[PDB]
Amino acid sequence: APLISVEKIQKLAQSYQGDTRKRFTAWGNLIDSLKKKPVKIQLEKVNSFFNQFNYETDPITGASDDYWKSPVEFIVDGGGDCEDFAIIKYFTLVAVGVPSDQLRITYAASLTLNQAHMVLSFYPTPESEPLILDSLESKILKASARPDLKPVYSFNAEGLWLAKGDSKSLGKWDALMKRME
Numbered sequence: 224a225p226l227i228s229v230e231k232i233q234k235l236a237q238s239y240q241g242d243t244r245k246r247f248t249a250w251g252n253l254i255d256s257l258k259k260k261p262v263k264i265q266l267e268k269v270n271s272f273f274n275q276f277n278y279e280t281d282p283i284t285g286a287s288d289d290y291w292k293s294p295v296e297f298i299v300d301g302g303g304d305c306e307d308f309a310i311i312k313y314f315t316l317v318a319v320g321v322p323s324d325q326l327r328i329t330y331a332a333s334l335t336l337n338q339a340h341m342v343l344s345f346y347p348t349p350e351s352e353p354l355i356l357d358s359l360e361s362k363i364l365k366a367s368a369r370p371d372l373k374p375v376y377s378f379n380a381e382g383l384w385l386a387k388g389d390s391k392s393l394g395k396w397d398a399l400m401k402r403m404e
Contacts, residue, residue: 277302
């Protein structure tokens, strides 16, 4: 299971220049700063840090791109689509110490935008109502406070779950994690 580390990040930073180098350093500093902080603060600051990046959409559909970006690709590009935001938030939260089993990247139907939309769901317990970390809403809100989002499936490095796992049955995700190796 691919890992993000402050040490790998600091070395990436020195291979780039200008603002790109600064983004890597900032990402590494974020991870360092959030270790051993309250979970709520970790969620809030990873969410807000990444929500400042460039939000991309397909010019034709207005929705996400077919290609899923690794965290490094997101940083190099200076942003990505809703799926890419959720992915880097996920890996970064795992890096600061939120247990991966409490985090599920979630593919949902947006009932308001009439298109698919990806968010990161945080589960206090697996039976608990999840908190939604979104790229089109700054607040972290409970699922029942997001009736505009209807989950279809969710996944993380370990599993894949249908709404109502072997995440590698998700081809782009399998390939994504292999790029991170």
